[PDB]
Amino acid sequence: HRLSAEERDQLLPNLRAVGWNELEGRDAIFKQFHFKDFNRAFGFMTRVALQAEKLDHHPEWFNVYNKVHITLSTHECAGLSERDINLASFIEQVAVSMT
Amino acid sequence: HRLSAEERDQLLPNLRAVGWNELEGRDAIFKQFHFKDFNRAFGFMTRVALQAEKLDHHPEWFNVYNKVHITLSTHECAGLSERDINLASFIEQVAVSMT
Amino acid sequence: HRLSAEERDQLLPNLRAVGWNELEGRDAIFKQFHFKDFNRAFGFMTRVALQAEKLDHHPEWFNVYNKVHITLSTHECAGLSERDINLASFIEQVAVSMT
Amino acid sequence: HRLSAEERDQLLPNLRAVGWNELEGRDAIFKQFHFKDFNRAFGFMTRVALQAEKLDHHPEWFNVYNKVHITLSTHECAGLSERDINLASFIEQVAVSMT
């Protein structure tokens, strides 16, 4: 679970490669996505929310018009678990659908 | 307003080349999109329904899992229109992002 | 799996009881729901979607503006399982929120 | 376009009843919501998006699992515009139904 140094290192990169940062202050990983419009920003949030239940691992996000900032980090192990590694991979896999 | 043939005949094809088409019993173009999973078929519907609402033009649709069949017309025209038309173009895009 | 006698006789009674009719041709239950607008008809569709994907059991729905028509049967059974039934009512409990 | 003194006094109150609050800093009301679960909250987030779409006046929101926090200001106005005053109001027409 609660990412080991050992793990967390090797999982983190690709995420790291795309904008996903570690948060100073908590064991979390954030990222803001800036779409082209609302229809997209929300088309995005949807497939993602359709997928946060599927897993029963929900994000911390915030949309305005076309930017959403997503913060991931497990409540169960008060940390970054593989759980959100997955979810983020999926999150990424979705934005790419959107422009 | 209701498409003439000069109209139908400029407008049409472009969508037709794509897979859209008149119904035999009535003035309306069908098309049935088919994705990879439910999640994608729904994100696609979320994207058109935001759109629908916006420009107040709705589809008669039908989804199962990952299949979604869309049929357009304009109700106060008893037939095709510019609306139907703008709509398929849209839906057409959104759809091209799901593959 | 394929809901049997008392089972049905005990379970189905309740749904018919709320307009859940029975399908002529398949082993399925169906329902059509009139909403006041699309703003509803879709805010519902979505909350049911979120669930059809939480339990991996999807509806067959058709939607025009405010109407929604739901057919439910498990095809792995090819017929009325539980699946329908406990989804039938989640889906009922939804329609109450808006209708 | 911007909400005079009068306007607020008539306009702003009732909203103020049910929870709406004006923040200090830029001109804008605010309102944390909390629902049973994420179905319920996204179910509500959608009807609300369908509308900010129909009307082109989008909220500024944050969603955790079931907690949803809204903030409405009007870019031009650099404060409350009649748009905001009613989007809150729809946003309540939505809310209650959920519970």
How would DSSP label each residue in D56-78? T---EEEESSSEEEEEE-BTTTT
CA–CA separation, A45 and A42 (whole Å)? 5
CB B17 within 8 A of CB B56: no
CA–CA separation, C63 and A17 (whole Å)? 42
DSSP D19: T
Chain C closest-CA separation from residue A82 CA (Å): 20
Residue D39: its chain C contacts at CB < 8 A? 47, 50-51, 54
Comparing alpha-carbon positions, the chain D residue that sits nearest to C90 is D39
CA–CA separation, A83 and A57 (whole Å)? 7
Contacts of residue B18, defined as CB under 8 A and 6 or more positions apart, other chains included, come to B31, B92
Opening angle at CA B15, ends B12 and B20, nearest 5: 100
Burial call D56-83: b when 16+ CB within 10 Å, e when fewer: ebbbebbbebbebbbbbbbeebebbbeb
CA–CA separation, B51 and B55 (whole Å)? 6
Is there a catalytic annotation at residue A76? Answer: yes
Annotated binding-site residue? D97: no
Count of C-beta atoms within a 10 Å radius of residue A75: 11
Structural domain spans, chain A: 1-99
CB D72 within 8 A of CB D87: yes
Which tokens hold the place of C23?
A: 């399908």
Which of A38, A54, A97 is nearest residue B97 as measured by Cβ atoms? A97
CA–CA separation, D92 and D44 (whole Å)? 10
Instruction: List the 45-64 stretch of A: residues with Cβ below 8 A of D.
Output: 46, 49, 52-53, 58, 60-64
For residue B86, which amino acid is it? Answer: N
CA–CA separation, C87 and C71 (whole Å)? 11
Radius of gyration of chain C (CA): 13
> How far apart, in Å, are the Cα atoms of C90 and each of A25, A70, D51?
40, 29, 25
Chain D closest-CA separation from residue B6 CA (Å): 32
Which of B54, B62, B76 to substitute to test the interface with C, most C CBs within 10 Å? B62
DSSP B74: B
CA–CA separation, A25 and A83 (whole Å)? 20
Which tokens hold the place of B79?
A: 């037939």
> How far apart, in Å, are the Cα atoms of A57 and each of A5, A41, A42, A85, C53?
22, 20, 19, 11, 14
Alpha helices in C29-81 (DSSP H): 38-52
CA–CA separation, C67 and C36 (whole Å)? 8
Is there a catalytic annotation at residue A69? Answer: no
Annotated binding-site residue? D57: yes
CA–CA separation, C20 and C33 (whole Å)? 10
The experimental method, as deposited, was X-ray
Query: Cβ contact (<8 Å) for C64 and B60?
Result: yes
Chain D closest-CA separation from residue A95 CA (Å): 19
Residue of A22, A57, A82, A92 marked catalytic: A57
Opening angle at CA C13, ends C9 and C14, nearest 5: 135
SS3 state at C27: coil
Number of B/D CB contacts below 8 angstroms equals: 13
| CATH T-level fold of C1-99 | Gyrase A; domain 2 (3.30.1360)
| Residues belonging to chain A | 99
Count of C-beta atoms within a 10 Å radius of residue B92: 16
CB B26 within 8 A of CB B17: no
For residue B43, which amino acid is it? Answer: G
CA–CA separation, A48 and A35 (whole Å)? 14
Query: Cβ contact (<8 Å) for C47 and D42?
Result: yes
Which of B97, D53, D99 has its CA nearest to residue C96? D99
Contacts of residue A89, defined as CB under 8 A and 6 or more positions apart, other chains included, come to A14, A15
CA–CA separation, C75 and C59 (whole Å)? 11
Query: Cβ contact (<8 Å) for B54 and D49?
Result: no
CA–CA separation, C32 and B59 (whole Å)? 17
